């Protein structure tokens, strides 16, 4: 419920890896297609991320992701630091994938049906985790 | 000065393409380096965008940039429209290509070099363009 801890990880599909970023006190989403799981792509997505949303910490659920020389120079650089302190988690993730194989036929590649999903999630009132999002950033301005 | 407003750009730099987008009432920007100018990497980008944040129109200084059929898939399918309606995009991709020049020897690649860059712009204060995007959006919401 912090507003800076953020939740990532990888899935899979149709032999591709999809990395996906939860902000947690909102649900928001982003995710990113990404030719296969390295340390590099890790690294690249942490300093994109924080580049443009106030990331303090990140959790995941495959601890041994975030071990690479690369991915620890990312977030030092960044200043992050990992969340050592779940049914939102859950949620998210799955209904991504739910979206995912709706919208799939709408698009060439997965990497835009993917996007077209993060779109959906976003936008989806029941206000939406996008507008959670601005207004959980904009409230702890104050 | 509306909310919805973007403008996207691509510069060159050492061989490469960054494209630039710019948050006009914020001076906010997203940006990312890609192999070659292509509709193909324009419509993915611009789909990324609306994703995360409300884009409701887009301008740009290469209207040529937005005919292809690709990016014009894009735009229908987010509701994006091309705006026809000055210094603050100047201003901002100027000071990004100066701070890419600073950062450029602390990172191994120009990609990183720019998301660093990224990074520096939006959380400089002279309030930041981080904060004001989410003051603008979060107060737009009501
Ligand atoms: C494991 As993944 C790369 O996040
Ligand atoms: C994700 As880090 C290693 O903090
Ligand atoms: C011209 As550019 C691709 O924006
Ligand atoms: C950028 As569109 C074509 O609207």
Same mark, same amino acid.
């Given at each position: 419920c912090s507003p800076g801890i953020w939740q990532?990880?990888?899935?899979? &599909?149709?032999?591709? !890896?999809? &990395?996906?970023? !939860?902000? !947690?006190?909102?649900?928001y989403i982003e995710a990113e297609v990404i030719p296969a799981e390295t340390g590099q792509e890790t690294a690249y997505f942490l300093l994109k991320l924080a580049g443009r949303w106030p990331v303090k910490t990140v959790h995941t659920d495959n601890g041994s992701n975030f071990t690479s020389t690369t991915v620890k120079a990312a977030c030092w650089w960044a200043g992050i630091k990992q969340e050592f302190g779940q049914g939102v988690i859950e949620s998210m993730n799955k209904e991504l994938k739910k979206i995912i194989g709706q919208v799939r036929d709408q698009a060439e590649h997965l990497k835009t049906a993917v996007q077209m999903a993060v779109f959906i999630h976003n936008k989806k009132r029941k206000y939406s985790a996008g507008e959670r999002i601005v207004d959980i950033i904009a409230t702890d301005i104050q």
């Amino acid at each position: 419920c912090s507003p800076g801890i953020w939740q990532l990880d990888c899935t899979h &599909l149709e032999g591709k !890896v999809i &990395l996906v970023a !939860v902000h !947690v006190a909102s649900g928001y989403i982003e995710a990113e297609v990404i030719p296969a799981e390295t340390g590099q792509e890790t690294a690249y997505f942490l300093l994109k991320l924080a580049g443009r949303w106030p990331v303090k910490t990140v959790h995941t659920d495959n601890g041994s992701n975030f071990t690479s020389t690369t991915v620890k120079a990312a977030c030092w650089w960044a200043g992050i630091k990992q969340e050592f302190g779940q049914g939102v988690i859950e949620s998210m993730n799955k209904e991504l994938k739910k979206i995912i194989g709706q919208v799939r036929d709408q698009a060439e590649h997965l990497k835009t049906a993917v996007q077209m999903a993060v779109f959906i999630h976003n936008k989806k009132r029941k206000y939406s985790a996008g507008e959670r999002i601005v207004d959980i950033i904009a409230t702890d301005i104050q």
